[PDB]
């Protein structure tokens, strides 16, 4: 009954006769399944975890320059030299500046100069490769028990969590008291994980095209890298200036964090917060129910009377939910329930919370049902003090 | 002699007869002035200071969100409320989320929710208005004294610094021993300081168009602001998400420092380093020299002989500089100097360091001159041991 209240809720039924139904689950979605003489079940995808992906590449988005050093020669004395030209942590550039008596040389002319500065990354983002085969999904299965506190309860302590791995065969789920259900889920698509990259910048994350990702004009490190200091193409976050031929300067280019966010505007978002998976694709599972059975079909219709404990309320999909309490001494018994026409002559609506049964004299029971458009009567209990509640839909 | 060595050096002469010459100075530039019976002078613009300009607007480029709070109502219960909706430091957004039994409401439906978070700027940039009227320029005037250590000496302790303010009348400069010169400088143009804004992001600075600046999609504060917390349009660095109608989130948009740098690529740069003014416009000054006079026109040509102390060297503009020392007993006397043709019959070149005079037996003297293209002889001193140095130009 976890789904009652969610608006992105889908109602699914199987092929008449068969005991297998196919459903699709996406974060933020909810699915209510039904089948002849089978308990109604609610399904919700709680999490999508990718177990250790490959780091295609690592980009620097904010850096710092330090230990600037420089060397220079006089006209006709060749190029200057710095050992830092070999230290892969440093970025360098050669250039010319004016020279002559006033600054040390015997000749006036252009003399070589070389400037180097240590480049240290302060913030970085990673591109990872995800393969469908290894994506674990956590799904919560909550059956329509009618339990006092189950309507829309997200605590998860009414449902049964199951972990599923796409290409790791069938998964078995034991629903206490109802039997056992089976799920065969398919990874295959929503999108292709070969030409796409999962990009992570702290708690934010998107799925982007490989090409686009590989063409980002930022300093980088190969996926395999550990040291995290020998960045390739540091020049992309650096700027060398020698405007008047007097001296050469180097300055960092400033955090690209936002520029990135701005360029990722049109990209598929995965999550903005630590534990708020937004999208993840559509998970398809085939549900087997031959080993699933209704609960209490050994009972007899109660004979006593009921009291409305929580007035009839309509959900965002036209179904109604009501909560009644038994006052009869029948103990474990089936609750009489039917939706009749204005004159109580013919039956018009169906139960979603099929096989409503009391379990304890004082444990109220929730019943979801689908009345017909227009007028109808909700008849609860049997004759002596039988509840006859009128309702109008949509 | 400060200019000897700089490549962006310009040689300027006045209208024959007049004693007024016009020059143009720009950072990274140098100007050598000459005039009949007047000392040759070198001019260099050392600094451009804008005295307390007006802050047109202040933009936030990096922010932080904190103290997130939220309020919500049930379907049909109207809008939620937070006092932070009035606290100008907070950014807020109203929205809907699903409600029903499982999360507190008696009815299932869409209920109002409102979310607020405190927005605190961590880094910002300012746009300032510069008025030509109030721009102070520091200029160093260094005359061609021929002093042993003056060639290309940037120490500034050979020159005379003068501060100039465009529309504050004429400025008087006293050149020790040479008299006094006068400068009348004009602010008027390079560009229109009305439709342009000086933008500063730490030590970096550009001149940009007012419109473009005012249209930057960032959070701002009016120029006059002091508090620095009641940012207008905070929504531009913030993002509210309510993808599944379950709850609403807010996340900062990330430093725009680099994006700004990137958008400022084609803009006019003023400086990248704390004290490295790159550009500043072209400063025009009219130089009056009627009160300026040569030094030592009471002396007689030396009669002794000279020794070359620093061999003839050519500058990047075809002039040559030489340094000689006197061995004669003439004390304060004019140095005989001329550039003759191959046969020493006719005169061909001019002195830049006009009126070369010894001052102390042992103080070497530097002379800059402009020999003719091709062959020529540099004749120094008189007959007995007269220096006859051959030279070839360009
Ligand atoms: C979602 O479910 C939780 C807990 O689920 C269990 O609830 C019990 C009643 C039973 O159905 C079991 O099978 C479910 O898994 C709900 O939290 C529970 O709330 C009730 C009442 O608020 C608590 O019962 C007790 O009531 C007596 C009153 O006589 C008090 O003295 C006790 O202190 C206590 O409140 C019960 O302890 C809670 N159980 C847990 C695990 O916290 C929760 O309300 C529900 N969500 C909604 C909105 O329906
Ligand atoms: C730029 O100029 C500075 C100083 O300018 C002054 O220099 C003196 C000589 C004089 O012309 C005065 O009018 C100038 O304003 C040059 O620095 C000076 O360097 C000299 C020699 O290196 C120093 O002279 C002394 O020499 C005796 C040797 O007998 C030593 O014992 C002394 O310690 C001292 O070195 C003099 O002190 C320096 N003056 C200053 C203010 O530092 C500088 O070299 C020059 N730049 C170039 C490259 O030409
Ligand atoms: C089509 C959507 C792209 C594939 C979705 C898989 C990405 C899962 O998202 C990532 O899962 C990690 C698992 O530990 C978490 O640590 C991260 O917080 C989360 O961003
Ligand atoms: C056409 C170029 C725009 C006008 C140039 C004037 C800007 C000088 O630039 C500013 O001067 C300030 C004065 O204190 C300094 O504090 C700053 O470091 C500097 O950026
Ligand atoms: C950079 O400077 C620091 C402090 O001056 C020094 O300790 C360090 O050795 C320098 N780094 C390198 C590799 O030159
Ligand atoms: C934000 O939270 C801090 C610490 O929890 C608290 O001291 C402060 O009062 C809060 N700020 C506001 C204005 O709500």
From Swiss-Prot, chains A, B:
Disulfide bonds join 3-30, 60-121, 74-105, 92-116, 185-285, 302-333. This is Envelope protein E. Coiled coil: none annotated. Residues 1-394 are extracellular. Residues 98-111 are annotated as: Fusion peptide. It comes from the Viruses. Homodimer; in the endoplasmic reticulum and Golgi. Interacts with protein prM. Interacts with non-structural protein 1. It is a multi-pass membrane protein.
């Amino acid at each position: 009954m976890r789904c009652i209240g969610i608006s992105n809720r889908d109602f699914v039924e199987g092929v008449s006769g068969g005991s297998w139904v196919d459903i699709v689950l996406e974060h933020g979605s909810c699915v209510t399944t039904m089948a002849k003489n089978k308990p109604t079940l609610d399904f919700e995808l709680i999490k999508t975890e990718a177990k250790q992906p490959a780091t295609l590449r690592k980009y620097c988005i904010e850096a710092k320059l330090t230990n600037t050093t420089t060397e220079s020669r006089c006209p006709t004395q060749g190029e200057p030299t710095l050992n830092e030209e070999q230290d892969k942590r440093f970025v360098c550039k050669h250039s010319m500046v004016d020279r002559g008596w006033g600054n040390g040389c015997g000749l006036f002319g252009k003399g070589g100069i070389v400037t180097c500065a240590m480049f240290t990354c302060k913030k970085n983002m990673e591109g990872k490769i995800v393969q469908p085969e290894n994506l674990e999904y956590t799904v919560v299965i909550t059956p329509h028990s009618g339990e006092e506190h189950a309507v829309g309860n997200d605590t998860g302590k009414h449902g049964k969590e199951v972990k599923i791995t796409p290409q790791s065969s069938i998964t078995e789920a034991e629903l206490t008291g109802y039997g056992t259900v089976t799920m065969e889920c398919s990874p295959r698509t929503g999108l292709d994980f070969n030409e796409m990259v999962l990009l992570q910048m702290k708690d934010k994350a998107w799925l982007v095209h490989r090409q686009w990702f590989l063409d980002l004009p930022l300093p980088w490190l190969p996926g395999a890298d550990t040291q995290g200091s020998n960045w390739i193409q540091k020049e992309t976050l650096v700027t060398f200036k020698n405007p008047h031929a007097k001296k050469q300067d180097v300055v960092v280019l400033g955090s690209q964090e936002g520029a990135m966010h701005t360029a990722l505007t049109g990209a598929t978002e995965i999550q903005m917060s630590s534990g708020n998976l937004l999208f993840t694709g559509h998970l398809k599972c085939r549900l087997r129910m031959d080993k699933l059975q209704l609960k209490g079909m050994s009972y007899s219709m109660c004979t006593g009377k009921f009291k409305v404990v929580k007035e009839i309320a309509e959900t965002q999909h036209g179904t109604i939910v009501i909560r009644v309490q038994y006052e009869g001494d029948g103990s474990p018994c089936k609750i009489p329930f039917e939706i009749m026409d204005l004159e109580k002559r013919h039956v018009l609506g169906r139960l979603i919370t099929v096989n409503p049964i009391v379990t304890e004299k004082d444990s109220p029971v929730n019943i979801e049902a689908e009345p017909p458009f227009g007028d109808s009567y909700i008849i609860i209990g049997v004759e002596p003090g039988q509840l006859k509640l009128n309702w109008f839909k949509k």
